[PDB]
Design an enzyme around this catalytic site. Structure first.
Site, PDB file in Angstrom:
ATOM      1  N   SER A  77      29.088   1.448  32.544  1.00 13.70           N
ATOM      2  CA  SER A  77      28.326   2.184  33.542  1.00 13.70           C
ATOM      3  C   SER A  77      27.164   1.339  34.064  1.00 13.70           C
ATOM      4  O   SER A  77      26.586   0.518  33.352  1.00 13.70           O
ATOM      5  CB  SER A  77      27.803   3.492  32.938  1.00 13.70           C
ATOM      6  OG  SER A  77      26.913   4.174  33.812  1.00 13.70           O
ATOM      7  N   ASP A 125      43.568  13.179  23.543  1.00 13.25           N
ATOM      8  CA  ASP A 125      42.446  12.381  23.062  1.00 13.25           C
ATOM      9  C   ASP A 125      42.561  10.951  23.575  1.00 13.25           C
ATOM     10  O   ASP A 125      43.314  10.149  23.010  1.00 13.25           O
ATOM     11  CB  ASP A 125      42.440  12.407  21.536  1.00 13.25           C
ATOM     12  CG  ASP A 125      41.276  11.648  20.947  1.00 13.25           C
ATOM     13  OD1 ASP A 125      40.368  11.288  21.714  1.00 13.25           O
ATOM     14  OD2 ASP A 125      41.284  11.403  19.727  1.00 13.25           O
TER      15      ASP A 125
END
Length: 330
Positions: free
Chosen positions: A199, A35
């Site tokens: 992004s 994770d």
């Protein structure tokens, strides 16, 4: 040193991925959910409330000659999906894919919430976010990557998740045969303890690319792609019959649909998520309403590049003095 381990989807939807981890002496092998959105290595154990164990493999520290109780240490964690676990702490030897760390904090669960109990395939979590998020008290503990970093050939790990197929986590090296083209690196903020990046925009299907900054986290422990409501609405508007359902808890679409791809920007580069990766199947057994793999982050507080996005790429988690993330097509 290096390590290399195969990671396998727990079910036919790729709801999560498990990777075998050796703990203790002699080794006890548990299948853990790696994770990158959390920083605790915790396991079902011989200390877990018996009614809360249902098919998982447990770690028994009393059977490990290298286990030592970390006196006074406790842990307690809550995840973005509402699940939680807590317990006490041992140090022990932990190996992943041939890479060994001695004295790793192994957090032994005394309690786990129902969703962990109900998932017989996940024996615990291995956190790979930054150690500043580790919940051990009163002395915070380091992640497996943090403990191994100095020994690794290069201070990196990579995530290569498969679509309906096994993939690989590598530690300490970049497998240049595992991706196409070049790796595009992008800046990371560690201020929230996550692999947090920006992004450069998105496209829906064959549509034109929209340049827009989207701050979010690279999180292998989250199944879906969670993005701003504007972006998610633009995606699902291209799917006839798709709608946001309050009763189901997100966007659903007719299972008869063919989904468009979704592209996200990494600097000047582009990662394309095929439409099929966004199909999470019937909302309930036999239903013709299917659950979408792209969902709004509006109720989270952060955008999450989860498995839906990451499995379309070869992803480098660069733990150099200034961390960065790298993405390549594959």
């Amino acid at each position: 040193s290096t390590g290399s381990a195969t990671t396998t989807p727990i079910d036919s939807l790729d709801d999560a991925y498990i990777t075998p981890v050796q703990i203790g002496t002699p080794a006890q092998t548990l299948n853990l959910d790696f994770d990158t959105g959390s920083s605790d290595l915790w396991v079902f154990s011989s200390e877990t409330t018996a009614s809360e164990v249902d098919g998982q493999t447990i770690y028994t520290p009393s059977k490990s000659t290298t286990a030592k109780l970390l006196s006074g240490a406790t842990w307690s964690i809550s995840y973005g999906d509402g699940s939680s676990s807590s317990g006490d702490v041992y140090t022990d030897t932990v190996s992943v894919g041939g890479l060994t760390v001695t004295g790793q904090a192994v957090e032994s669960a005394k309690k786990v919430s129902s969703s962990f109990t109900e998932d017989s395939t996940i024996d615990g979590l291995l956190g790979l976010a930054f150690s500043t998020l580790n919940t051990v008290s009163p002395t915070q503990q380091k992640t497996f990557f943090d403990n191994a970093k100095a020994s690794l050939d290069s201070p990196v790990f990579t995530a290569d998740l498969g679509y309906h197929a096994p993939g690989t986590y590598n530690f300490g090296f970049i497998d240049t045969t595992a991706y196409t083209g070049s790796i595009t690196y992008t800046a990371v903020s560690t201020k929230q303890g996550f692999w947090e990046w920006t992004s450069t925009g998105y496209a829906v299907g064959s549509g034109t690319f929209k340049s827009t900054s989207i701050d979010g986290i690279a999180d292998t422990g989250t199944t879906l792609l969670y993005l701003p409501a504007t972006v998610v609405s633009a995606y699902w508007a291209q799917v006839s019959g798709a709608k946001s359902s309050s009763s189901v808890g997100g966007y659903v679409f007719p299972c008869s649909a063919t989904l468009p791809s979704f592209t996200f920007g990494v600097g000047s580069a582009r990662i394309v998520i095929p439409g099929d990766y966004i199909d999470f199947g019937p909302i309930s057994t036999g239903s013709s309403s299917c659950f979408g793999g792209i969902q709004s982050s509006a109720g989270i507080g952060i955008n999450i590049f989860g498995d839906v996005a990451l499995k379309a790429a070869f992803v480098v988690f660069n733990g150099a003095t200034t961390p960065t993330l790298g993405f390549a097509s594959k």
